[PDB]
Amino acid sequence: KPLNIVYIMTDDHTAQMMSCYDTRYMETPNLDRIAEEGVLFTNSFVANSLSGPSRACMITGKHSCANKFYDNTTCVFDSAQQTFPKLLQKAGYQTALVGKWHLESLPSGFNYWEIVPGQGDYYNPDFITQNNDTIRKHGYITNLITDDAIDWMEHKRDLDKPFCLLIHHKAIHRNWLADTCNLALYEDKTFPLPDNFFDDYEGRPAAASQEMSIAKDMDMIYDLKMLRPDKDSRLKALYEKYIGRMDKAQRAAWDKFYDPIIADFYRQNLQGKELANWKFQRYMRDYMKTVKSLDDNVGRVFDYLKKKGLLDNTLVVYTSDQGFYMGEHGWFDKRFMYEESMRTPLIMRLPKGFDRRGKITEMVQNIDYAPTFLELAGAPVPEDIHGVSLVPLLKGEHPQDWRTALYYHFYEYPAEHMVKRHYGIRTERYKLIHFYNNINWWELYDLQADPTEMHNLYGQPEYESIAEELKVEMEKLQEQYNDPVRFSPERDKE
Numbered sequence: 469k470p471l472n473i474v475y476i477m478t479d480d481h482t483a484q485m486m487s488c489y490d491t492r493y494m495e496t497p498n499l500d501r502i503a504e505e506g507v508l509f510t511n512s513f514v515a516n517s518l519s520g521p522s523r524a525c526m527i528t529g530k531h532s533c534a535n536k537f538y539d540n541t542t543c544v545f546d547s548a549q550q551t552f553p554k555l556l557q558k559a560g561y562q563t564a565l566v567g568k569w570h571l572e573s574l575p576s577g578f579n580y581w582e583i584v585p586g587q588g589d590y591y592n593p594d595f596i597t598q599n600n601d602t603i604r605k606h607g608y609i610t611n612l613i614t615d616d617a618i619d620w621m622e623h624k625r626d627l628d629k630p631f632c633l634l635i636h637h638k639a640i641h642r643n644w645l646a647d648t649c650n651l652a653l654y655e656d657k658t659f660p661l662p663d664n665f666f667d668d669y670e671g672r673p674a675a676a677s678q679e680m681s682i683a684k685d686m687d688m689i690y691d692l693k694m695l696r697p698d699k700d701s702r703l704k705a706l707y708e709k710y711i712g713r714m715d716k717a718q719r720a721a722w723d724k725f726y727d728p729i730i731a732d733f734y735r736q737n738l739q740g741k742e743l744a745n746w747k748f749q750r751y752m753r754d755y756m757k758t759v760k761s762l763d764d765n766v767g768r769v770f771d772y773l774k775k776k777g778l779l780d781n782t783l784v785v786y787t788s789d790q791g792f793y794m795g796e797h798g799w800f801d802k803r804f805m806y807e808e809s810m811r812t813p814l815i816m817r818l819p820k821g822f823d824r825r826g827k828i829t830e831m832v833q834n835i836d837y838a839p840t841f842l843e844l845a846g847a848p849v850p851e852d853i854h855g856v857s858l859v860p861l862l863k864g865e866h867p868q869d870w871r872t873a874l875y876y877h878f879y880e881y882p883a884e885h886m887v888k889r890h891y892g893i894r895t896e897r898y899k900l901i902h903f904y905n906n907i908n909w910w911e912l913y914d915l916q917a918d919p920t921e922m923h924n925l926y927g928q929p930e931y932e933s934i935a936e937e938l939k940v941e942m943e944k945l946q947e948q949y950n951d952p953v954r955f956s957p958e959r960d961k962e
């Protein structure tokens with residue numbers, strides 16, 4: 469029969485926290501086994517570095533300007549539009565979705581779905597059944613999503629149709645609540661700060677004006693768990709709501725671990741660089757405790773597929789809705805076109821008939837997933853899709869007409885973290901960014917000389933011709949993808 473697809477996508481995972489990409493921080497042996505028996509994309513990006521927009525780009529193969537899902541705060545996905553799950557059903561597939569959806573409208577084009585409301589919760593999450601009833605799933609969401617994915621494959625799947633299963637995790641979303649079994653891990657880990665952790669944002673006004681600084685914005689109580697009745701913070705009430713979901717046993721285990729860390733913190737006088745360093749270590753540790761459950765649960769899926777003899781005829785994909793700042797530029801979160809958040813990890817275990825192993829370097833984006841899946845399914849690829857099937861790359865081809873540039877557009881401002889709206893072009897060599905709301909500011913980076921984007925070159929006479937050439941190339945992409953911002957900054961959402 470046609471190939472199956474198992475697509476696993478996390479929330480705010482990132483290459484820096486996957487050992488197949490980066491060995492500074494975290495071991496991810498189960499994620500690494502997907503890449504090891506397949507390929508890893510070294511130049512993998514998103515079109516709009518935010519969860520809902522990324523999820524709309526994923527299912528449509530289109531930039532936000534065409535799918536109309538611009539942000540997490542003002543949009544409801546019009547599910548009448550073309551999506552790859554519906555096209556796969558029309559090609560004889562069954563389709564299934566578990567976990568985070570984050571498109572506001574109910575999933576369509578799925579034979580089975582069971583999702584969280586909005587962002588979901590780590591402990592004792594509510595879910596929404598396919599009848600739009602709310603149910604309680606007691607336990608820890610990374611385990612529960614996996615349980616339901618495997619239950620669907622084992623007991624619900626029609627054995628007479630090929631399938632596409634989407635497994636959409638809440639891990640590793642803020643505020644990084646570990647499962648009971650992992651509470652104690654990584655306390656023996658202390659990391660060097662990133663070289664640009666104390667970035668002064670010279671030449672970069674949108675970098676200066678964000679509210680996603682570990683030092684300044686990360687919340688001692690909500691993010692770093694330092695709750696005590698005599699302490700207050702902006703997000704203390706939200707913190708108490710989220711850990712308030714825990715039952716007595718879950719909270720007792722939580723407190724057994726955190727109570728000593730709380731006591732040790734409040735005994736100290738910490739400020740400035742010493743406090744920023746303390747916050748970074750706690751952030752990294754809690755993030756990594758949260759990754760551990762995710763890696764183990766991806767292992768469960770991998771081991772199940774292997775035992776059932778499904779891997780030979782199944783593409784296994786692992787990615788994140790976007791990358792994430794692990795202290796680069798002093799940040800957490802995403803949103804910017806800057807490299808760490810424009811990038812997203814992408815690894816695939818390749819089925820029988822694809823011998824390629826190792827690294828793929830051609831520039832790929834989340835708008836490419838839909839046409840890839842349709843081609844692998846033997847389904848027609850509609851011309852209105854913006855992305856390009858990656859199947860030639862999986863086959864070891866280097867197409868002469870492969871793209872030389874990617875487009876990007878981020879829209880969610882004013883909003884949480886206060887990242888200005890911006891669009892831009894990224895080539896193999898350069899990135900040109902236009903921040904357009906609520907400032908008018910261009911930036912140019914030489915990604916070869918300056919891969920950490922510390923030196924805005926825009927306005928230097930020796931880069932005038934490069935900047936003008938990139939504007940011409942970017943306008944051609946805006947024409948290709950029909951982004952009306954090319955006409956006026958006020959026409960960014962038409």
Ligand SMILES: CC(=O)N[C@@H]1[C@@H](O)[C@H](O)[C@@H](COS(=O)(=O)O)O[C@H]1O
Pocket residue numbers: 479480518519520540587641642643703801884885
């Ligand atoms: C207080 C709090 O947790 N705020 C987070 C933000 O840091 C995050 O930026 C936003 C969007 O993330 S997204 O859904 O991954 O795009 O989700 C909120 O839940």
Ligand SMILES: [Ca+2]
Pocket residue numbers: 478479480518519641789790
């Ligand atoms: Ca996310």
